Amino acid sequence: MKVGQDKVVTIRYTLQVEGEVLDQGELSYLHGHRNLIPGLEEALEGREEGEAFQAHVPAEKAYGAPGIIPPHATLDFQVEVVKVREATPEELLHGHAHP
Amino acid sequence: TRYWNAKALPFAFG
Ligand SMILES: [Cl-]
Numbered sequence: 001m002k003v004g005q006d007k008v009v010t011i012r013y014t015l016q017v018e019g020e021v022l023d024q025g026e027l028s029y030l031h032g033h034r035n036l037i038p039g040l041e042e043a044l045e046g047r048e049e050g051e052a053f054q055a056h057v058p059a060e061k062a063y064g065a066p067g068i069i070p071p072h073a074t075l076d077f078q079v080e081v082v083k084v085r086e087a088t089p090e091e092l093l094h095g096h097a098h099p
Numbered sequence: 100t101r102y103w104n105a106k107a108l109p110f111a112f113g
Contacts, residue, residue, distance in 0.1 A: 013109060015108070015109070022100070023100060023101060023108070027109070027110065029110070034111060035110060035111055036109055036110060036111055037108060037109050037110070037111055037112075038111075040109055062105070062108055062109075062112065063104075063105070063107070063108075063112035063113075064102075064104055064105025064108050064112075065104075066104065067102075067104065067105075077109065
């Protein structure tokens with residue numbers, strides 16, 4: 001399936017800034033409800049399960065930046081769409097993905 | 100590595 005409005009999407013992600021790996025992990029989210037940092041779900045829009053790609057979010061637009069992240073820097077995400085599925089009644093009711 | 104000031108990332112803040 002394609003990432004779209006009201007789908008529950010599972011991604012694997014790696015966060016780098018200027019070539020330095022800062023974080024890695026996996027998450028699930030309900031698409032179309034501003035649940036991720038600005039720019040990331042827009043990069044995910046329309047993608048199929050199994051797609052791997054990069055997304056770039058200005059660090060300013062996320063609340064994380066007293067750090068190793070320079071101001072005006074870019075957050076480079078390497079993202080892989082692991083699974084896309086229909087949301088359950090619970091998930092649609094609350095606007096968030098559930099385990 | 101996650102830290103307090105960026106704990107939600109890449110989920111939206113708040
Ligand atoms: Cl969510």
